[PDB]
Design a protein around this ligand. Structure first.
Ligand SMILES: [K+]
Ligand SMILES: [K+]
Ligand SMILES: [K+]
Ligand SMILES: [Mg+2]
Ligand SMILES: [Mg+2]
Ligand SMILES: [Mg+2]
Ligand SMILES: [Mg+2]
Ligand SMILES: [Mg+2]
Ligand SMILES: [Mg+2]
Ligand SMILES: [Mg+2]
Ligand SMILES: [Mg+2]
Ligand SMILES: [Mg+2]
Ligand SMILES: [Mg+2]
Ligand SMILES: [Mg+2]
Ligand SMILES: [Mg+2]
Ligand SMILES: [Mg+2]
Ligand SMILES: [Mg+2]
Ligand SMILES: [Mg+2]
Ligand SMILES: [Mg+2]
Ligand SMILES: [Mg+2]
Ligand SMILES: [Mg+2]
Ligand SMILES: [Mg+2]
Ligand SMILES: [Mg+2]
Ligand SMILES: [Mg+2]
Ligand SMILES: [Mg+2]
Ligand SMILES: [Mg+2]
Ligand SMILES: [Mg+2]
Ligand SMILES: [Mg+2]
Ligand SMILES: [Mg+2]
Ligand SMILES: [Mg+2]
Ligand SMILES: [Mg+2]
Ligand SMILES: [Mg+2]
Ligand SMILES: [Mg+2]
Ligand SMILES: [Mg+2]
Ligand SMILES: [Mg+2]
Ligand SMILES: [Mg+2]
Ligand SMILES: [Mg+2]
Ligand SMILES: [Mg+2]
Ligand SMILES: [Zn+2]
Lengths: 80, 60, 24, 98, 64, 206
RNA sequence: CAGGCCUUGACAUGCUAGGGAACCCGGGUGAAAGCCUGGGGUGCCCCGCGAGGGGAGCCCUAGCACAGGUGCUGCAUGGCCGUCGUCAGCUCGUGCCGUGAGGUGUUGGGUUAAGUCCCGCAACGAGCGCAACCCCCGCCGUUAGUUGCCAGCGGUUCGGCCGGGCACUCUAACGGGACUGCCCGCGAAAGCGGGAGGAAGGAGGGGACGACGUCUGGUCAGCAUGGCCCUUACGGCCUGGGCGACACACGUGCUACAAUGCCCACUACAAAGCGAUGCCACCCGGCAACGGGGAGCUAAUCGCAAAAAGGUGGGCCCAGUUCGGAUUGGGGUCUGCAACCCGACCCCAUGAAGCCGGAAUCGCUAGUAAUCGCGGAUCAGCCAUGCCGCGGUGAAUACG
């Protein structure tokens, strides 16, 4: 039962940094702190290193994991 | 209540959802009333002194 | 009971409105 | 038709002061609509008595805002003489509406 | 009738009726008093105190 | 750790507020931070004058600020050289064309805050505590009064273990509302920490 | 906590110096901080015809005096609070008794909620406490009618809507009233037990009030403060994370396990409060949360606001059920820069435990318990089932 509204949020830090990598083919890795940003299509086939709060975790973004947010793939806590 | 945090006054939050009352008298940031700008403690003190017009000891 | 979101009481207790408890 | 509300914290001043406006017209105006009470708006403040913990103590404080009406029907022109600058209260506020 | 609840009112009505019924004929007090309909029930919702869940009902303390 | 403030406990009765004025939920706080800041400067300044009370009245941008002092001299100054500085220094903080009286305390030995300050001073002056207390009560108990009492906190004479010395005379029925007990607290900074002096002076009755 | 950064600072008072005044708009890299940089801009004093020169305020660099620490010590401390405990007790003055610590008073008999009062007494009196003066509730009056009503009577757009009246209700100021005063019985008194009259009867209910002191009680993270300790950092900025973890255990609670009950209709009766950049009537879109538009409020005048339990009618027929609503898929609305971690709120689908709880253990003596709903502080929103108040309905029992 998730939600947000009409305007799908994404931080332009990497947006105008992810598409900017497209107008040149592709790239490899992107160091980010903004896990607040919603994963959109122009990312599919990329590798975004998200931040735990300690380190940057590589995250090969895929087709299905679109509607989700970067943070959902960067587990914060460490357990048994 | 480190001076560095009594900077709250900024009003230059960059995002208004960062603003936060904070007692004007003791810097208190945890039980600050609106109508006084004073925390629950400071309010008790000055109230006793009578430096808060009208504010009397309620009973009933 | 006061804990069933979809009942008259559910809404009242939770102090909300909706299909199961319209605003007059 | 002179409506003048009287709001204050002190029911004695806002009361005497209120009966000041009443006579400063009973010598130059309609019998006036007399001094009307009007419910008081109490504001309560409840705080844990001491600092740190002890959440079961607390002390209760209230700010009682008393009110009044007065109201001088018959816009007497001779009344504003006695009711111009012949006041004395210190914690009272006054609203004038015709 | 106004204020309160229908059962409170029922008792209020009980007063007026006997209070008016007395003004009508003061010789009626002598028969009403023995059953005190002339008395005003002072029992009123007792205030809620702090520290207590509701006036008298106190919180529950664990393995003291 | 009990006992309510004697003043706060007697506001509606034998004892009136030190700030009389109505305000709305939009200005009350402002007319307070300021109203308080007034007491802030006046306290640091008119110290030597020995300021007992600092009433303050307000209206449409008006201000009373009646300052009660034992020695009004230091207040006013040379002819009027000072009561002018501290009024221009005052109205500077708050552009409200503020008045500024200077009442005189008839017998400062019935002014609890003063009596407290007195004892407080003597303590910073390495004096003997018990004496000052006994004296204070006497001075106050002699200048008329139906009762009096003084309480110095702890760490007496720099003594490792804090204590609490007091002594008093006449009556000081803190439980009776219809009394009138000027209360006055005075701190006392030292080389070995703070001390707290408290003063009570049972003046009238009904 | 990790990482990127400032280091005379985010904030005080000052200082000697190269320099440009102030303060306005820019651009690079940036996660943001920062850091590098571009123009706009030459006001104010005393000189000088002028170029310009030296000063004021301000800011800027480099070096100072110093800022800053929610760093340690609540046994170095102030202040405030908790606690025994609203328990009825703790003391003093003078006298008297003891070599003395100390005693007497305060013990004793009656009595009381009470060191409350009476009677006794080498004690006579006092303080601090009890009580009483303060608040709220219960009856009546006086003052006061843009809130009350045909109480009356006159017009109904049948709405106290009109007229106009304050009498009622109420609102809120001020007073009246209760004193064991009156009657009988007991007593020596104080004061019991009964009766009358009264709204109210013997502290009429409920508050605020908590003595000398005791826990080396609590708080250095509210604040204040002595002493230690750090100063390119234990100080400061920021982005992100964590305070929300989960094999487990406990406290306080919420919702239940159902028929005296649960649904859906329709209907009736409260009090307190709150409402500018906020309550939001009404109308329209949507199942709805909510969205549009939009009247009124500056608030006894408008709004929050439906009170709910109750009542009338209908359904369910004893089933894990039309009980219970956990969990989990979906699809949405909002606030907010932003709801992954980690927000409520709708709507569809899911429909878990739970048939009243071992040993133990808690509350409450009357408008109390139990039960029902309403408001507020804080607050963008909210994780409030918390807390502080509010008013409906309204018991059981106390031999001892
Ligand atoms: K129930
Ligand atoms: K201690
Ligand atoms: K289960
Ligand atoms: Mg958005
Ligand atoms: Mg500090
Ligand atoms: Mg906030
Ligand atoms: Mg705050
Ligand atoms: Mg159900
Ligand atoms: Mg109740
Ligand atoms: Mg007192
Ligand atoms: Mg020139
Ligand atoms: Mg301690
Ligand atoms: Mg302490
Ligand atoms: Mg500790
Ligand atoms: Mg003696
Ligand atoms: Mg002997
Ligand atoms: Mg002797
Ligand atoms: Mg003795
Ligand atoms: Mg004895
Ligand atoms: Mg006594
Ligand atoms: Mg009446
Ligand atoms: Mg007798
Ligand atoms: Mg008392
Ligand atoms: Mg300790
Ligand atoms: Mg302890
Ligand atoms: Mg301690
Ligand atoms: Mg926590
Ligand atoms: Mg329950
Ligand atoms: Mg049942
Ligand atoms: Mg609609
Ligand atoms: Mg619709
Ligand atoms: Mg979240
Ligand atoms: Mg069953
Ligand atoms: Mg009891
Ligand atoms: Mg609620
Ligand atoms: Mg809220
Ligand atoms: Mg939650
Ligand atoms: Mg709630
Ligand atoms: Zn404060």
């Amino acid at each position: 039962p998730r939600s947000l509204k009409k305007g799908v949020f994404v931080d332009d830090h990497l947006l105008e940094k992810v598409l900017e990598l497209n107008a040149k083919g592709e790239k490899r890795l992107i160091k980010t702190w903004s896990r607040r940003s919603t994963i959109v299509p122009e990312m599919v086939g990329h590798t975004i290193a998200v931040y735990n709060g300690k380190q940057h975790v590589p995250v090969y973004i895929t087709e299905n994991m679109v509607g989700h947010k970067l943070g959902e793939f960067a587990p914060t806590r460490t357990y048994r | 209540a480190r001076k560095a945090l009594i900077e709250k006054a900024k009003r230059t939050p960059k995002f208004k959802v960062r603003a936060y009352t904070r007692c004007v008298r003791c810097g208190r940031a945890r039980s600050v009333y609106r109508f006084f700008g004073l925390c629950r403690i400071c309010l008790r003190e000055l109230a006793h002194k009578g430096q808060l017009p009208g504010v009397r000891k309620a009973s009933w | 009971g006061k804990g069933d979101r979809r009942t008259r009481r559910g809404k009242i207790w939770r102090g909300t409105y909706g299909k199961y408890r319209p605003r007059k | 038709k002179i409506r003048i509300k009287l709001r204050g914290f002190d029911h004695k001043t806002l009361d005497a002061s209120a009966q000041k406006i009443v006579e400063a017209a009973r010598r130059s105006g309609a019998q006036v609509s007399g001094p009307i009470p009007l419910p008081t708006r109490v504001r309560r403040f409840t705080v844990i008595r001491g600092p740190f913990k002890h959440k079961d103590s607390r002390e209760h404080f209230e700010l009682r805002t008393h009110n009044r009406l007065v109201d001088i029907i018959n816009p007497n022109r001779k009344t504003i003489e006695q009711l111009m600058t012949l006041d004395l209260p210190t914690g009272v506020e006054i609203e004038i509406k015709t | 009738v106004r204020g309160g609840g229908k059962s409170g009112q029922i008792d209020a009505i009980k007063l007026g009726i006997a209070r008016a019924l007395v003004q009508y004929n003061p010789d009626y007090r002598a028969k009403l008093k023995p059953l005190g309909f002339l008395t005003r029930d002072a029992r009123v919702v007792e205030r809620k105190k702090y520290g207590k869940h509701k006036a008298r009902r106190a919180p529950q303390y664990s393995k003291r | 750790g009990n006992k309510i403030h004697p003043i706060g406990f007697r506001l509606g009765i034998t004892r009136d507020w030190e700030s009389r004025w109505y305000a709305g939920k939009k200005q009350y706080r402002h007319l307070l931070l300021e109203d308080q800041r007034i007491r802030g400067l006046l306290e640091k300044e008119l110290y030597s004058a020995g300021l007992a009370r600092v009433d303050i009245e307000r209206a449409a941008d008006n201000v009373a600020v009646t300052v009660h002092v034992a020695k009004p001299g230091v207040v006013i100054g040379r002819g009027g050289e000072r009561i002018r500085v501290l009024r221009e220094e005052l109205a500077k903080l708050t552009g409200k064309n503020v008045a500024l009286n200077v009442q005189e305390v008839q017998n400062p030995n019935l002014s609890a805050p003063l009596v407290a300050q007195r004892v407080a001073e003597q303590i910073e002056r390495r004096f003997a505590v018990r004496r000052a207390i006994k004296q204070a009560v006497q001075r106050v108990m002699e200048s008329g009064a139906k009762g009096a009492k003084v309480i110095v906190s702890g760490r007496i004479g720099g003594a490792e273990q804090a204590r609490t010395e007091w002594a008093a005379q006449g009556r000081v029925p803190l439980h009776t509302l219809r009394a009138n007990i000027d209360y006055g607290f005075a701190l006392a900074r030292t080389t070995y920490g703070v001390l707290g002096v408290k003063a009570y002076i049972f003046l009238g009755e009904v």
